[PDB]
Structures are given as C-alpha cells and as structure tokens.
From a paper:
Flavin‐dependent halogenases (FDHs) carry out substrate‐specific and regioselective halogenation reactions in the biosynthesis of various halogenated natural compounds. FDHs are a promising alternative since they are able to halogenate different moieties under mild conditions with high regioselectivity. Here, we show that the tryptophan 6‐halogenase [name] efficiently brominates the tricyclic indole derivative tryptoline (1,2,3,4‐tetrahydro‐β‐carboline) with high regioselectivity. Tryptoline belongs to the group of β‐carbolines, a family of natural and synthetic indole‐containing compounds with broad biological activities, like anticancer, neuropharmacological, or antimalarial.
To gain a better understanding of how [name] achieves regioselective halogenation of non‐native substrates and how the structures can be altered to allow for halogenation of similar or even bulkier substrates, we aimed at solving the structure of [name] in complex with tryptoline by soaking crystals of [name] with a tryptoline‐containing buffer. The tryptophan binding site of chain A contained a large and almost planar difference density, while the active site of chain B appeared to be empty. After several cycles of refinement and model building, the difference density was interpretable as tryptoline in a unique binding pose. In addition to the tryptoline in the active site of chain A, both chains showed fortuitous binding of tryptoline at a position where physiologically ring I of the FAD isoalloxazine moiety binds.
Author numbering:
A (entry chain A): 2 to 529
B (entry chain B): 2 to 450, 463 to 529
The structure:
C-alpha cells in the first residue's frame, strides 16, 4: 500500500475548508485529513460572488442542499455582474452617467447561453441590426431575458422555489468557511489543529515530511496543501517556488472594503453584483440580506490609501473617520508551478486576480477538482503533477487575459489610471480574439446546451469564457465588429428566424418581470 | 452590393456534389451555383465508410431523411472499424490469428460512448482490473455492448426502427454522388455543366475570374471551389499553393481495390468496416447489400503494385488475371493553406489520409460547413480566410496524428513495412497524449452525450494494440465505492449486450426490409 495516508492542509478560510470537505468526500475516508488553522480576529464580511456551477460541482457533490448552506451564510442571488460607468469619465458614483448617444452607461454580463438560428448565435444577428441601425437595443437587453428581470430586481426563482433562470450566489465567505469547517469536522473526521505553523520539515529531496506548530506538536503528512493565502508559506517560502507577478497585465493591487447596512424593504435587493468604475479602479457591490459588501479595488501607483478610502467613502456617503474598513495589498499573478514535489497550492497561495468576474471560488474548486483527479500515490508520478500544473496555468492566464480586456477596451482616458491601462501590452490570445470578433466571427462558440455546461465540470472548464461573455464585455464597452458576419448577407430566412428569437426573449422577460417575486421577498421567505 | 454572386465548383463526385448541395441550402438561393464535371468512365464501386455525424451534420441540414438516401446508394450499417491481425505476424488473412493470452487478434473501435462512475470513464476501471490481474476481458468486450452485437452481426436498429446503438454508414460513393447531383439540380437550382476545363483565367491580383471549357463556354464566377481531386487543378496548379507532403507521418501511398460479390444469405452481413492487416499495409472490407468493397492500402516503398495485387487477390481467393482492379496512388498531407484568394479547396484537392478511420467524407462536410460559416463577400476579408484555414489544418493534423498512432504502436516487426513505421517521428501532440495515457489519465475526455477523437477512441486503439498505462489511475486506489459502482456498469454492459443480441434483427434482415 503505497498510498498517501495523511493530507495536511495549511490554512483555513474558504480555500482550506473547501479542500478539506471536498477531499473528505473524494477520497472516501481512505486518507487522514488535518487542517492547521491559525485562530484569527473575525474580519468584517465584505461579500463574495460566485458562478452558477458552485451548487452542482461543490455543495451537491458533498450532499449539502442549497438552502441549508445559504441560510447559514446570509446568501443572496446573482444573475450577472453589472458594469456601471466603465465608458464615461468622472468621479465614482453609484448612479450611471449617460453616454453621448443617450444610453445609460450600464451593461450586464449574465450567465445564460445564447440561442442560435441556422447555427449562428443570437449575438451575431443583434450585431448586424445594431450596425445597420435597425435596432437601438443594447446587446444584453436584446439577447438575455435576465436583463429585464435584473432591471426590475426580481428573483431567479418563484416563491415555490421553481427555477426561472440560471443564477449564482453572493455570500459571507467567513460564514461559508465556518459552515464547511463544521461539516468537515463533525461529518467527515477532519482533525482541526488551531495553531500557528513554526517549521516546515523536509527530506533530502525537499519533499515536506511534517509541519511543526507553535505549541511544539509535529504534524506528519504525505501530501501538503498550501492554503496559507498570499504569503504562500509552503509553496513560496518553504519550497521557494517563484511567483510570476503579472502586474504588467493588470494594474490594480490594493483594496479597501467594508459592509454597509442596507434598507432592503425600502430599496429592494439587487440580484446581481455591481462593478462600479472609479478614478483609479472600481468598486464591487455584493447585496446580501440587510447589508451589501463593498470594496474599492485600486492601483496604489495611482491613488494613495487615503485617496482610495475617501473616494470609496464618498461613493456610499460614509464617514471615513467613523467607518470600519479592511485594507489589503495583493499580488497579481500565479506561481511558476502550482504543485511542486508534494506541496499543492490552492487559492491565494496559488494565484489571484481582482474579483472583477467572480473568479476566486471557482479557482479554488477547479484546483481541488483537478487534485482529486490527479491524486498521486507516494511515487508522485511527474506526469500527474505536470498535467495538474498545466491545467492551473491555462485556467489562470485565460481569465487574466479576459479581465485585461475589460480595462484595455474601456474607452476611458480621463485619469492617469485609465490611460495607463492602454499602455500595457495585450496578450497574444486576446489580440487574436479581438481580430476574430472584429471580422464578425464568434469567439469560443458554446458546443453544449446550458444544462450540460453548468452541470458537467469539464464542459465549462474547457469553454469557460464563451462567445456570449466576449459579446457582453466587448459590446458592453462599445467595441463592435467592423461589419456583420458576411454569411448573414446570404441568409434572409435565418435573419427572419432570429427575429422570432428576439421576440421570444421579449415575451419571456415581460412575463417574468410580471410574475416573479422580488429578490427581497424570495430572500425573506428563504431566510425565515 | 459586394456579395459573391456566382460560385463555380470544379469537379463532381462526392466532394463536388456535397459542396453544391450544401451551399445550395446554406446560401438560400442568393448565389448562383455551377458544377463543372468532367464526364467519366464509371469505375467499379470500391465502397466508402463514414462516421456517425454524417446524418446530423449533412443530410439533416439538407432535410434528406436517412432512409431516402440509403436506399439510393445500397447503404448498410457501420458500428465500428474492426482491426484484424495488427498485432500478429504473417501473410494477410480474413481470419484472426491468436494472441498469447488466448484472445483472437481482433479489436473494435465502436461509436458508443463510455459510461462513467464518479466522473471517471469505464475505460479506467477496466484498465485498473486488467493491470491488477482482476480481469482477462478485452477493453472492447468489457466496455461496449456494441462489441457483442457486432460479434453476432446484429443490426444497430430493431425492425420497427427504434435505435439500439450509435452507428454510421457504408455506401457506394458514385451512387451517393449521383443522388446528390439529382438533388442539387432538381431541388436547389444548381447548374450542371458536363465538359472539360481547358483554361483557368486569372486577373492581375491572382484571383480566378472564370474557367474556360473545351466547348468554348466561359464560366464566370466570384468564388471557386476546387473539388478536382488529387490534381488540385485550381488550388495547386492555378493558384500555385504548395502541398505539404506528410509521408513522414504515414507511409502508405497506394491502393488496389475491387468489389467482391458476397453470399449474404449464407454468411450474414457484418455491421462494421474491417481493417485487415497485410505485410505492407492493410486491406479494407466495407460490406454492402450483396457485395463488399475491398481495397489493399500499401506503401509502394515496400511493395510493388504487382506484389500488392497478388497479396490482395490471395486474401479473398481471387483470380488476379480475371478480376477487375482499380489502382490509385495518393498524396498524403494537406495544402499549406486550404483557401487562397478566392479559391477554396474541398476533398482530395485539400488534403488526404488513407481511409483507416473513415475520414474522407467527414473532411468534405466539415470544410463546407466551415465555408458556409466563413462565407465571404467580394472583399475576401483576410481574417475569414485565415480562420477557415486554421480549422482545416487542425482538423487534418489531429486525424493524421490519430492514424499514425495505429501504426507506431503496432507490435508487428515481421516485415520491413511494419519495422519502418517505428522510424517515423511521432508528432508532438500524439507523444503528449501517449504520456498522458501512460500515467493512467484520460485523453480528450468527452464533455457531451472540436473533440473529435475522444478518450474512448484512444483506449480503443492503444488497448486494442496492447499498449496499456504504466499503472492504474492512482485516484482509483482511494475510491472503493467508485470501483463498486463501476462493477454495476460492467454488469449493465453484459446484460444489455445479451438482451440485444437476443432481440435485434440480423444486419442482413434489416437491410432486406430497408431495401425492399
Ligand atoms: C459573470 C461572472 C462569471 C461568469 C461565468 C460565465 N458568465 C459569467 C458572468 C460563464 N461561464 C464562466 C463563468
Ligand atoms: C483583494 C484581496 C483579497 C481579496 C479577496 C476577495 N477580494 C479581494 C481583493 C474576495 N474573495 C476573498 C479574498
Ligand atoms: C479587502 C479585500 C478582500 C477582503 C476579504 C476580507 N477583507 C477584505 C478587504 C475578509 N473576508 C475575506 C476577504
Ligand atoms: C486510397 C486513395 C483514394 C481513395 C478514395 C477512397 N478510398 C481511397 C483509398 C474512397 N473513394 C474516394 C477516394
Ligand atoms: Na498597448
Ligand atoms: Na492571367
């Protein structure tokens, strides 16, 4: 029996306790699991956003019903990221300015998949009409019924919990961590050691054999998961694996955040995450029951912490002298290798981007999914480790490129921050995709229906940012194809068939805006 | 109005008439379509095999029901390619030799999809048992109920046409061409010009402007599709686009073929294509109603045309002096670019590999599908042309790699041909996949009920030829519940196979019903 017998996970929070719970289930009680978590001072809950596959890929795999965990972490509902003021100059404001053409400066990035007609996505029929002046509708409203639902702040489910649309989740991350920690300890025999690490003990080859705690106890193991966050106490410090800084792709490096109490009854609750453009970055807004998490992501090359905190406070009309703020400086990039020897990095210790498209928890899940799939024995076959690393680096770089596109193709040039983003070099892959897009061709066309896509892990991981997402962002920001897809000029029936699709989207949106409960009401029912 | 107005297609046969029929439909009568087809000497019908998505990708787009076209080309059913004697030395024989482990030297590459347990394909559970000495079943018999159905030569559908398994088709290519030509002419307003091309007229920019015929008629056009076959009269000759020879990946370059009458009543009809290994290549067998097509594919570096013809005759006990044979020498590879200026190559004029995995017609309809989607206007946007070319080259090279795997990993070393295959260099992408396979990892895992040769297909060939992972997927060592669930899957395959061998009609009977 040459199997891993003990897995030691350094660090708790979402990364550590998601790893523990997942491997507990994946490894079917054949492996001892230890979490070594420093006890810490509970931070204000600044809110986390997610993508639709979370319930299916993670909580369902563990057999945790959606409502059970949502009730334990003040969870609310997410149908998109909504971008505000990414095209127009000015101070940060929660309220959208107006474009030169009269439109409001908002655009949505929802989760559905576009319908097609004659094997051509709805996006392309919309672009032909917009380019030809046959419509004044925005891409998001024309192509996703969810746009209308969001505009009216209606829920993604009916009150009897019948599904109306695709959605994901907002939640308090520390509450989810605490919930998973309770799950793993009581239901899965995880040992929790509440202590600090003082030593990393290694054999002649540099493989970790044990961790010493501050109390003297030695925790032996065969596989070590670094969930220590940005410090990367195992992968970067002990194992000396270099972190590739990628601030030459994404400039932001700091965040100031808080939770803001919120009059839900008065204002309603938005079923979406908002990315509010600022002078030196952007501010998230993540509605939960009674409060929203908010954080201003910024480059400290272009704004001082005091500057950013003042602008962030002004956004919400906060007293900066009488408000509880969390400040963080982040590294942007990834390790040269995510897994070295018998040390697997997961979460912040592995890689990070600003949460502009809710990447964080997905990255954690994808890594632990891939770890379970590439799980070694004590011979640590190099190919298993290499293939895992390959998946992590491709996953990360692809999302990195995608986020850069948000900044590079913003028309804003009103502050040195927004100007500086256009001095950065675009990755080859996004240059290629823009070329494809500008000729009227689809980018990363979906090959699966929506059920398969969000229901099969590999279907989404292998096609993560689809054609619809590129259209949401490019068109949202005002970047259009140079011309329509030339094939459309030869296909009058197909154009006619797309008109019916456009009309189906209108009818569904109108019906659901009329019949759906408010997000607020669905939340009140759910959380008692 | 900068639209293409006229499309001229050089060449008929399957490539030309599939192109014409497809664009007829895709372009919705907004474009004139002309086919310039040399009248030719009807060759003996040596048979073509296909892959399952022919009906969905091609005939369904045209709205032609499967039975309508099958009846018009003597079509039969294909559930796999069955490889015979690819592991054992000797002269060519239709009968399988015997392996060291007692199994017959046959293995199947069927179209079904493997079930999974705990997100791990059945293949990996099978491999774990075989590596640990817990089973002596072959991969195909353990993992595909279709293997049992094929062994009993049963049909993939019942007599009331309920589907039982995935399948594809065998047919007479000239009959399919003739059927599509009639379709395209009568139903899609395609003009058929029966004449020989004498000149290809080009402007100052190197764009084709017209073809002159031997009768004097000038055929003007805006976009030209080269379906002229291996000669590539437009893409290679007129446009001067270089052909990339890839005989340094696949050694075979010639074929001798015929049709063989067949006693269906006595023998039944096999619902599969057979690849019968020979000393200097291999021989296809493509059963149809009343005859099977057969052709010996060979490298002429290692056997003369006369050598191959004798060995091919010997396989089936033919009189080589009194049998009508067709002889073809092929180019293996692809053009440097499939589409140059206003000339799009489709079919043999674009690219070719030996029909070891029935690639031929797939290459045609994928190209025309891609042409319709990248269809240009008269400005011929460079990006449209480049993106089309990228798809053809990836499609071709990927299938090329897959075919090389069949030869590189044969254990045969009994003739200079089989020895020579191990001197060739493996492409980077196929080396990578072998590395992945050998660690027990899946290759190109299917995400569905882009990814053309999936994990199941790699196992069919690797395991079929005797190449196993170094060890089981290590994760399985931690998953006793998952192994127990896979056992139920294995039992489902036995129970399904047994039930269907008992309830299905023979292929022969289903064919009689269909063609009567
Ligand atoms: C907003 C935030 C994340 C996503 C993802 C999709 N749409 C989004 C919208 C589609 N699949 C990948 C993840
Ligand atoms: C900056 C630094 C860290 C973070 C984290 C989030 N946003 C950040 C911004 C949300 N997920 C948890 C961690
Ligand atoms: C700024 C950016 C991210 C964070 C996180 C906390 N505070 C922050 C401040 C605490 N919860 C987890 C993440
Ligand atoms: C070898 C060379 C050419 C061919 C063709 C088929 N098989 C071949 C084998 C099928 N019909 C069209 C052409
Ligand atoms: Na630049
Ligand atoms: Na000329």
């Amino acid at each position: 029996d040459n199997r891993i017998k003990t897995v030691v996970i350094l660090g708790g929070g979402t990364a550590g306790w998601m790893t523990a719970a997942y491997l507990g289930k994946a490894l079917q009680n054949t492996v001892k699991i230890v979490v070594l978590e420093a006890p810490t001072i509970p931070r204000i809950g600044v809110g986390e956003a997610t993508v639709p596959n979370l319930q299916r890929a993670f909580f369902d795999y563990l057999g945790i019903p959606e409502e059970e965990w949502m009730r334990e972490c003040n969870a609310s509902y997410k149908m998109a990221v909504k971008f505000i003021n990414w095209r127009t100059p000015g101070e940060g404001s929660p309220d959208p300015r107006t474009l030169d053409d009269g439109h409001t400066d908002t655009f949505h990035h929802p989760f559905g998949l576009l319908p097609s007609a004659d094997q051509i996505p709805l996006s392309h029929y919309w672009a032909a009409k917009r380019l030809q002046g046959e419509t004044d509708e925005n891409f998001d409203e024309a192509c996703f019924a969810d746009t209308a639902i969001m505009n009216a702040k209606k829920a993604p489910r009916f009150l009897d919990m019948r599904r109306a649309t695709n959605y994901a989740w907002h939640f308090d991350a520390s509450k989810v961590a605490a919930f998973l920690r309770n799950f793993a300890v009581t239901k899965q025999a995880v040992e929790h050691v509440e202590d600090e690490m003082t030593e990393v003990l290694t054999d002649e080859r540099g493989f970790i054999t044990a961790l010493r705690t501050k109390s003297g106890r030695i925790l032996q193991g065969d596989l070590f998961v670094d969930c220590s966050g940005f410090r990367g106490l195992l992968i970067n410090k002990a194992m000396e694996e270099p972190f590739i800084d990628m601030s030459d792709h994404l400039l932001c490096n700091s965040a100031v955040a808080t939770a803001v109490p919120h009059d839900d009854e008065k204002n309603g609750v938005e079923p979406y995450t908002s990315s509010i453009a600022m002078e030196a970055g952007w501010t998230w807004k993540i509605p939960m029951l009674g409060r929203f998490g908010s954080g201003h992501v910024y480059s400290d090359h272009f704004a001082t912490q005091d500057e950013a905190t003042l602008a962030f406070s002004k956004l919400w009309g906060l007293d900066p002298d009488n408000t509880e703020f969390n400040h963080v400086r982040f590294r942007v990039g990834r390790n040269r290798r995510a897994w070295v020897r018998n040390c697997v990095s997961v979460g912040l210790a592995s890689c990070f981007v600003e949460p502009l498209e809710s990447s964080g928890i997905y990255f954690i899940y994808a890594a632990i999914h891939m770890l379970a799939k590439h799980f070694p024995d004590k011979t640590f076959d190099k190919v298993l480790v290499d293939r895992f690393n390959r998946e992590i680096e491709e996953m990360f770089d692809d999302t990195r490129d995608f986020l850069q596109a948000h900044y590079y193709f913003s028309p804003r040039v009103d502050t040195p921050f927004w100007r500086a983003n256009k001095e950065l070099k675009l990755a080859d892959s996004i240059k290629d995709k823009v070329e494809t897009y500008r000729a009227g061709l689809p980018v990363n066309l979906p090959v699966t229906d929506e059920g398969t896509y969000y229901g099969n892990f590999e279907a989404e991981f292998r096609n993560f940012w689809t054609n619809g997402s590129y259209y949401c962002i490019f068109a949202g920001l005002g970047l259009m194809p140079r011309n329509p897809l030339p094939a459309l000029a030869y296909k009058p029936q197909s154009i006619a068939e797309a008109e019916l699709l456009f009309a189906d989207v209108k009818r569904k949106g109108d019906t659901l805006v009329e019949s759906l409960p408010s997000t607020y009401d669905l939340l009140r029912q759910l959380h008692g």
